[PDB]
Amino acid sequence: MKKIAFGCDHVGFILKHEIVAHLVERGVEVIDKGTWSSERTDYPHYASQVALAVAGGEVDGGILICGTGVGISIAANKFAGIRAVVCSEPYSAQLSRQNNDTNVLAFGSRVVGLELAKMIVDAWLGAQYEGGRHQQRVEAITAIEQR
Amino acid sequence: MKKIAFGCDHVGFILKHEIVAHLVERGVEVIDKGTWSSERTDYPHYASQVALAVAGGEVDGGILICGTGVGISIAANKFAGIRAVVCSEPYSAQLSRQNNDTNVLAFGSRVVGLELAKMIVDAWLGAQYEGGRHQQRVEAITAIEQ
């Protein structure tokens, strides 16, 4: 995860500058997909921008923030080749990389505070997909897509 | 949410008996898609069973349990007509009903303890979808499905 496409709605935006700064500090190139203010806007559009960038290989992964991260991650997961984890603790983030090869992480600005959110990001970026027995399971997910 | 399709893998199974018993205590009729023991099994199959039930209108919603809930909910979200929330607290569950009309709830037997899980289930079951400005956003999720 060297370059990441970032997206958020107006509610997720409250964490944007700090999370972007944290990613730059961790040495990742952030491709910013918006939004750019607290002006009311629709989360599915930003989900699409990040998801398209990840699925099309222009970026290694995506990070998405809304009020809870849930709606924005449901939208992302609708795209083929996207496996998005939403969570409020770092164990789920870490294991989803290890077992599910997640390429998109989401969380909620009204659920997690900033420093917990930073720890979830670190746990996600720090984990490696373990393949092995988990591969046939991940392949089952793809099969669901292409039916 | 009067009829719920339930599914889990062998790790999610550690919460099955008490979560199913709790749904029944709250007057929910549970359609059990398995699994039925702690023998190793693959979570995508139980995701499909629940998703196909919800999508085909056989039940009102779905509940899924694995180690974290994430892989099983990612699988479920790949099905047309499913909006699945995974979480480890009740706020996300509740708001996902209110704003996103979620029809599947997932959580992790290795992430949340039993009584917190019951509270998440209660919040999800008790919340109403509010429609309004949210329907446009939900319609956009469906548009991605095509």
Residue B83 and residue A92: Cβ atoms within 8 Å? no
From the CA atom positions of chain A, what is the Rg in Å? 14
Nearest to B96 among A44, A45, A70 (CB): A70
With CA atoms as reference, report the closest residue to B66 among B42, B93, B89, B102: B42
CB B3 within 8 A of CB B57: no
CB B75 within 8 A of CB B37: no
Please state, in angstroms and rounded to a whole number, the distance separating the CA atoms of residues B121 and A9. 27
Question: Any residues with CB less than 8 A from the CB of B15 and at least 6 apart, and which?
Answer: B8, B65, B109, B114, B117
Q: How many domains does chain A have?
A: 1
How were these coordinates obtained? X-ray
Please state, in angstroms and rounded to a whole number, the distance separating the CA atoms of residues B131 and B115. 30
Q: What strands, in cross-sheet order, belong to the sheet with B29-32? A: B29-32, B3-8, B61-66, B104-108, B84-86
Residue appearing with tokens 């910013």: A32
For chain B, say whether A67 makes contact (Cβ under 8 Å): yes
Residue B140 and residue A100: Cβ atoms within 8 Å? no
Q: Which of A10, A43, A45, A70 to mutate to test the interface with B (most CBs of B within 10 A)?
A: A70
CA atoms within 13 Å, Cβ hemisphere of B30 = 19
Q: Encoding tokens for residue B54?
A: 């919800």
Give me the CATH number covering residue A69.
3.40.1400.10
Q: Which residues of A71-108 are buried (b: 16+ CB within 10 A; e: fewer)?
A: bbbbbbbbbeebbbbbbbbbbbbbbbbebbbbbbbbbb
Q: How many residues does chain B have?
A: 146
Question: Any residues with CB less than 8 A from the CB of A55 and at least 6 apart, and which?
Answer: A79, A80, A81, A82
With CA atoms as reference, report the closest residue to A7 among A40, A48, A39: A48
With CA atoms as reference, report the closest residue to B67 among A30, A114, A55, A96: A96
Please state, in angstroms and rounded to a whole number, the distance separating the CA atoms of residues B138 and B129. 11
Across A67-136, where does the E strand assignment appear? 84-86, 104-108
Output the DSSP codes for B19-74. Answer: HHHHHHHTTPEEEE----SSS---HHHHHHHHHHHHHTTSSSEEEEEESSSHHHHH
- DSSP-derived letter for residue A132 is T
Local structure of A7: helix, strand or coil:
strand
Name the maximum alpha-carbon separation found in chain A. Answer: 45
Resolution, Å (one decimal): 2.1
Q: Which of A50, A74, A109 to mutate to test the interface with B (most CBs of B within 10 A)?
A: A74
- DSSP-derived letter for residue A65 is E
Residues 115-134 of A with CB under 8 A from B: none
- List the domain range (segments joined by +) for residue A52: 1-147
Local structure of B8: helix, strand or coil:
strand
